[PDB]
Write an enzyme that holds these catalytic residues in place. Structure first.
Site, PDB file in Angstrom:
ATOM      1  N   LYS A  13       5.753  13.763 -16.889  1.00 14.97           N
ATOM      2  CA  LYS A  13       5.867  12.412 -16.315  1.00 14.97           C
ATOM      3  C   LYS A  13       6.475  12.519 -14.932  1.00 14.97           C
ATOM      4  O   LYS A  13       7.694  12.813 -14.815  1.00 14.97           O
ATOM      5  CB  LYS A  13       6.713  11.499 -17.213  1.00 14.97           C
ATOM      6  CG  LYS A  13       6.728  10.068 -16.640  1.00 14.97           C
ATOM      7  CD  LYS A  13       7.539   9.120 -17.522  1.00 14.97           C
ATOM      8  CE  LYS A  13       9.001   9.467 -17.647  1.00 14.97           C
ATOM      9  NZ  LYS A  13       9.739   8.447 -18.450  1.00 14.97           N
ATOM     10  N   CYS A  30       2.568   7.106  -1.576  1.00 17.54           N
ATOM     11  CA  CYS A  30       1.258   7.117  -2.195  1.00 17.54           C
ATOM     12  C   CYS A  30       1.284   6.494  -3.620  1.00 17.54           C
ATOM     13  O   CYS A  30       2.135   6.824  -4.467  1.00 17.54           O
ATOM     14  CB  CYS A  30       0.722   8.552  -2.213  1.00 17.54           C
ATOM     15  SG  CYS A  30      -0.871   8.740  -3.044  1.00 17.54           S
ATOM     16  N   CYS A  32      -1.981   6.306  -5.148  1.00 12.99           N
ATOM     17  CA  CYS A  32      -3.342   6.661  -5.583  1.00 12.99           C
ATOM     18  C   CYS A  32      -3.420   8.067  -6.149  1.00 12.99           C
ATOM     19  O   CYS A  32      -4.480   8.415  -6.659  1.00 12.99           O
ATOM     20  CB  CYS A  32      -4.366   6.488  -4.451  1.00 12.99           C
ATOM     21  SG  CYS A  32      -4.256   7.738  -3.138  1.00 12.99           S
ATOM     22  N   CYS A  41       1.991   8.949   1.438  1.00 17.08           N
ATOM     23  CA  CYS A  41       0.618   8.537   1.713  1.00 17.08           C
ATOM     24  C   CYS A  41       0.133   9.305   2.950  1.00 17.08           C
ATOM     25  O   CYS A  41       0.855   9.393   3.953  1.00 17.08           O
ATOM     26  CB  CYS A  41       0.580   7.018   1.935  1.00 17.08           C
ATOM     27  SG  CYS A  41      -1.012   6.339   2.462  1.00 17.08           S
ATOM     28  N   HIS A  45      -6.136   7.285   0.163  1.00 16.70           N
ATOM     29  CA  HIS A  45      -6.556   6.077  -0.554  1.00 16.70           C
ATOM     30  C   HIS A  45      -7.859   5.484   0.036  1.00 16.70           C
ATOM     31  O   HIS A  45      -8.646   4.913  -0.717  1.00 16.70           O
ATOM     32  CB  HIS A  45      -5.464   4.997  -0.546  1.00 16.70           C
ATOM     33  CG  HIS A  45      -5.008   4.577   0.822  1.00 16.70           C
ATOM     34  ND1 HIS A  45      -3.912   5.159   1.421  1.00 16.70           N
ATOM     35  CD2 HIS A  45      -5.505   3.630   1.657  1.00 16.70           C
ATOM     36  CE1 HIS A  45      -3.765   4.553   2.587  1.00 16.70           C
ATOM     37  NE2 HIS A  45      -4.709   3.632   2.780  1.00 16.70           N
TER      38      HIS A  45
HETATM   39  S1  FES Z   1      -1.841   5.428  -1.359  1.00 13.35           S
HETATM   40 FE1  FES Z   1      -2.433   7.488  -1.842  1.00 13.35          FE
HETATM   41  S2  FES Z   1      -2.895   8.431   0.051  1.00 13.35           S
HETATM   42 FE2  FES Z   1      -2.378   6.370   0.601  1.00 13.35          FE
END
Ligand code: FES
Ligand code: FES
Lengths: 64, 63
Positions: A13, A30, A32, A41, A45
């Site tokens: 986790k 990030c 994603c 990030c 995304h």
């Molecule tokens: S939210 Fe994952 S790279 Fe931007």
């Protein structure tokens, strides 16, 4: 379907915890699990959203 | 191929949240699984997601 496909798979986790005072003027996190700079990030995304039809994006913590 | 977000704010073409660091409380727990009913905050929905899919995702904590 899994959300995270390759990041730290030996960790059951994945949680990141930061002290607010230790963040710079702008931290972009990030959400994603496609960034090569996870937990930050790197704009991955954009590619994810285009290829899948998704609408995910990052969390921004900034200085006033 | 597979979408990460399935049901949150689908009328928004790119979901971004931005907070001022001075406005955060003593502990803010942010959802990174897009399954929380309290999005952008974590409500523990990641636990159910991880069990059902075999995933290992969890939240971001600013303390
Ligand atoms: S939210 Fe994952 S790279 Fe931007
Ligand atoms: S509810 Fe999504 S990371 Fe906890």
């Amino acid at each position: 379907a899994m959300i995270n496909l390759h990041i730290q798979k030996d960790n059951p986790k994945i949680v990141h915890a930061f002290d607010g005072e230790d963040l710079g003027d702008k931290a972009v996190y990030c959400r994603c699990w496609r960034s090569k700079k996870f937990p930050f990030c790197d704009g991955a995304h954009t590619k994810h959203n285009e290829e899948t039809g998704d609408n995910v994006g990052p969390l921004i913590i900034k200085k006033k």
